[PDB]
Design a protein around this ligand. Structure first.
Ligand SMILES: *[C@@H]1O[C@H](CO[C@@H]2O[C@@H](C)[C@@H](O)[C@@H](O)[C@@H]2O)[C@@H](O)[C@H](O)[C@H]1NC(C)=O
Ligand SMILES: *[C@@H]1O[C@H](CO[C@@H]2O[C@@H](C)[C@@H](O)[C@@H](O)[C@@H]2O)[C@@H](O)[C@H](O)[C@H]1NC(C)=O
Ligand SMILES: *[C@@H]1O[C@H](CO[C@@H]2O[C@@H](C)[C@@H](O)[C@@H](O)[C@@H]2O)[C@@H](O)[C@H](O)[C@H]1NC(C)=O
Ligand SMILES: *[C@@H]1O[C@H](CO)[C@@H](O)[C@H](O)[C@H]1NC(C)=O
Ligand SMILES: *[C@@H]1O[C@H](CO)[C@@H](O)[C@H](O)[C@H]1NC(C)=O
Ligand SMILES: *[C@@H]1O[C@H](CO)[C@@H](O)[C@H](O)[C@H]1NC(C)=O
Lengths: 109, 300
């Protein structure tokens, strides 16, 4: 609903930030974004309209949606550096559960 | 480039209804799909008002004024009926768009109440200690109205706040304190009431009424009075609130001599052939009391 979590990793590490949720009805939309001075949108998924990668075409291994009306909204980060460190927020719009939010503060040591 | 157009704050009056404006501005060539509209109160856990493109409206009083099934959702403006004190706060208007994602704005709702302004004069007498002479009351206002006094006389104000008849409203009462004097009665003092509900600040004027005993004075005599002079006249200059009810003429040695004849508020001096030395007294009567004024008259 509104959770903050600290994630610790090193240089060259692999991490999958997963937002797990369940709906009584259906999933409306879901997104991944990095929050700093501005909200920089990474990816958006809609069950009807599909995926949308804000950046380049090779975004196949960047996000995954694993579908009982249960889901796993995952953001994949591989061979990470100090520039990848920051706050990553996921927003899950569910019907009629509403908006769920989870903020992951990724720290590279 | 898709932006949400809405004001930072919106004024709404207590008891009546208010429309919270919120529109999604999309450039002519840009393509977007609004899955749903969301209205939420800051720190209320659940949602307040939701409009889904296929499901429709859902509320906790509240109504979507422009949203409709079939048409592409753009205007998320919501009408709030029967404004309460507890309705004042911060609200979020979220748009679940594709492929632009979630876009939102924060709107502050300001619950107001138009106050009833009334000015009054405080009738006072003469005393050393300062006492209120004017009154300015701003009944049933939200937030409490600002009251200031526009006067060159220079008087310290006694401003106090008291609860209003309706919940959330405050009545502001301000008293203009000043030491009462004769050179203050009749002068005007303006009260300036300021509130967000008013387009222009309401200015109310009150005319000070001070009750003072007669300020009796005698003018005319200038020592240059020769024997067998022209029929001179002495005037009794008097200023009092209320106005004088009588003018009595006499001397320290008893009644007026044959040369001095009383003409109400005036006194005619007939020519004399013998030297005289008499001190005339002018007695001015009023509701508060009577005051005296002496003047020495010498003819040589
Ligand atoms: C109304 O809200 C504005 C935005 O608030 C921001 O979002 C909420 C959810 C919190 O995270 C808060 O800390 C953020 O500042 C404020 O800028 C604005 O001052 C608020 N209005 C008043 C009068 O308090
Ligand atoms: C300020 O005024 C106080 C009196 O307040 C008044 O009380 C009655 C007579 C009503 O007219 C009411 O509306 C007014 O509020 C004094 O008690 C107080 O001493 C004064 N303040 C100072 C600093 O002297
Ligand atoms: C206030 O200002 C003027 C004051 O004039 C005086 O009125 C009364 C109190 C007597 O003392 C009189 O001899 C003075 O001429 C008024 O002419 C005016 O109408 C008043 N206005 C309001 C709104 O009260
Ligand atoms: C999750 O992370 C591990 C590495 O920590 C990776 O091997 C795995 O493939 C990731 N999961 C998915 C579903 O890709
Ligand atoms: C949106 O709604 C408001 C309030 O109902 C209305 O006055 C206005 O015409 C609408 N704005 C646009 C741009 O459609
Ligand atoms: C002034 O007049 C009043 C009323 O007639 C009277 O009571 C008072 O004694 C008079 N004063 C003098 C000094 O004559």
């Amino acid at each position: 609903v509104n959770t903050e979590e600290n994630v610790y990793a090193t240089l060259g590490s692999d991490v999958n930030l997963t937002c797990q949720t369940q709906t009584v009805g259906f999933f409306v939309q879901m997104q991944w974004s990095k929050v700093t001075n501005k909200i920089d949108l990474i990816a958006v998924y809609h069950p009807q309209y599909g995926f949308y990668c804000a950046y380049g075409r090779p975004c196949e291994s960047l996000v995954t949606f694993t579908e009982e009306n249960g889901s796993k909204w995952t953001l994949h980060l591989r061979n990470m550096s100090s520039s990848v460190s920051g706050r990553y927020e996921c927003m899950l719009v569910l019907y009629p559960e509403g908006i769920q939010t989870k903020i992951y503060n990724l720290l590279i040591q | 480039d898709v932006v949400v157009q809405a004001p930072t704050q919106v004024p709404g009056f207590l008891g009546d209804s208010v429309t919270l404006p919120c529109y999604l501005q999309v450039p002519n060539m840009e393509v977007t799909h609004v899955s749903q509209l969301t209205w939420a109160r800051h720190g209320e856990s659940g949602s307040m008002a939701v409009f889904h493109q296929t499901q429709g409206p859902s509320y906790s009083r509240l109504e979507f004024v422009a949203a409709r099934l079939g048409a592409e959702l753009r205007n998320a403006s919501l009408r709030m009926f029967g404004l309460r004190v507890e309705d004042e706060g911060n609200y979020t208007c979220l748009f679940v768009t594709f492929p632009q994602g979630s876009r939102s704005v924060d709107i502050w709702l300001r619950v107001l109440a138009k106050p009833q302004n009334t000015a009054e004069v405080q009738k006072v007498q003469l005393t050393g200690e300062p006492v209120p002479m004017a009154r300015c009351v701003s009944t049933g206002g939200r937030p409490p109205a600002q009251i200031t006094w526009h006067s060159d006389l220079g008087g310290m104000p006694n401003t106090s706040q008291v609860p209003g008849f309706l919940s959330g409203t405050v009545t502001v009462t301000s008293l203009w304190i000043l030491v009462p004097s004769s050179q203050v009665d009749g002068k005007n003092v303006t009260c300036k009431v300021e509130h967000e509900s008013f387009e222009k600040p309401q200015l109310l004027t009150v005319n000070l009424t001070v009750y003072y005993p007669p300020e009796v004075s005698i003018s005319g005599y200038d020592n240059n009075w020769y024997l067998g002079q022209n029929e001179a006249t002495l005037t009794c200059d008097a200023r009092s609130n209320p106005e004088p009810t009588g003018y009595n003429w006499s001397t320290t040695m008893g009644p007026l001599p044959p040369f001095a004849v009383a003409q109400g508020a005036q006194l005619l001096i007939r020519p004399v052939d013998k030297p005289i030395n008499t001190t005339l007294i002018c007695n001015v009567t009023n509701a508060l009391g009577a005051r005296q004024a002496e003047l020495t008259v010498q003819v040589k």
